[PDB]
Design an enzyme around this catalytic site. Sequence first.
Site, short mmCIF file in Angstrom:
data_model
loop_
_atom_site.label_atom_id
_atom_site.label_comp_id
_atom_site.label_asym_id
_atom_site.label_seq_id
_atom_site.Cartn_x
_atom_site.Cartn_y
_atom_site.Cartn_z
N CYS A 185 82.15 -67.86 -60.01
CA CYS A 185 82.51 -68.43 -61.35
C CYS A 185 83.02 -69.86 -61.11
O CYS A 185 82.26 -70.66 -60.52
CB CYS A 185 83.51 -67.50 -62.02
SG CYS A 185 83.66 -67.67 -63.82
N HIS B 203 80.89 -62.49 -61.64
CA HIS B 203 81.92 -61.87 -60.78
C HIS B 203 81.38 -60.57 -60.17
O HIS B 203 81.27 -59.57 -60.89
CB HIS B 203 83.18 -61.54 -61.61
CG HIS B 203 83.94 -62.72 -62.08
ND1 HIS B 203 84.98 -63.26 -61.35
CD2 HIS B 203 83.80 -63.47 -63.20
CE1 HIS B 203 85.47 -64.29 -62.02
NE2 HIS B 203 84.76 -64.44 -63.15
N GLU C 5 82.95 -58.70 -58.13
CA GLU C 5 84.18 -57.92 -57.89
C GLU C 5 84.63 -57.15 -59.14
O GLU C 5 85.68 -56.52 -59.06
CB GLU C 5 85.30 -58.85 -57.42
CG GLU C 5 85.94 -59.70 -58.53
CD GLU C 5 85.33 -61.07 -58.76
OE1 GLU C 5 84.09 -61.19 -58.59
OE2 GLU C 5 86.10 -62.05 -59.09
ZN ZN Z 1 85.21 -66.09 -64.41
#
Ligand code: ZN
Length: 183
Positions: free
Chosen positions: A76, A158, A160
């Site tokens: 990001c 993302h 994660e």
């Molecule tokens: Zn982000």
Amino acid sequence: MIVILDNGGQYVHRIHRSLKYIGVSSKIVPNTTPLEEIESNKEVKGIILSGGPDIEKAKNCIDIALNAKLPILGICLGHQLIALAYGGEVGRAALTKVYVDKENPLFKNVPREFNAWASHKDEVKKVPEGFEILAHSDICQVEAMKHKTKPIYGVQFHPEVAHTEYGNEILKNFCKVCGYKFE
Ligand SMILES: [Zn+2]
Ligand SMILES: [Zn+2]
Ligand SMILES: [Zn+2]
Ligand SMILES: [Zn+2]
Ligand SMILES: [Zn+2]
Ligand SMILES: [Zn+2]
């Protein structure tokens, strides 16, 4: 071990849990941590530049992106900071269908298509010179990128966050680039 630079994101600890899940150790350090401090610990195989809300509180990632000898994954904001560092263009923009054009290191053992999460508001509009696009969506041209000759990777999404399909496999793949073997 993988070093994760805390760019302020609410999902930074989730990167540390995802790595531990796939059997990889990690440490969350301030994004003001100098490179010479990270690269002096011989057990660090790679650096992750975390997500975060404010790119002005994360410009130390610029120098890290330019100077690291270790492989780098930007997530990001970390992806954007990589683009800015190398002269690429970043501009204004959650579940996105991501098309993999180059299976590269990052998307090995991932389908050609998958759903990826990110509520970003800023994206990479033009990849820096000497980079290539690995993945895109319907509208947005850059969902993930690599330097053509340096082990430098960015993903707008993302991996994660549970909402992202195959996110632990993408993190595992970056770990493979960092010289981790699995079996
Ligand atoms: Zn982000
Ligand atoms: Zn832990
Ligand atoms: Zn395509
Ligand atoms: Zn997007
Ligand atoms: Zn976009
Ligand atoms: Zn776009």
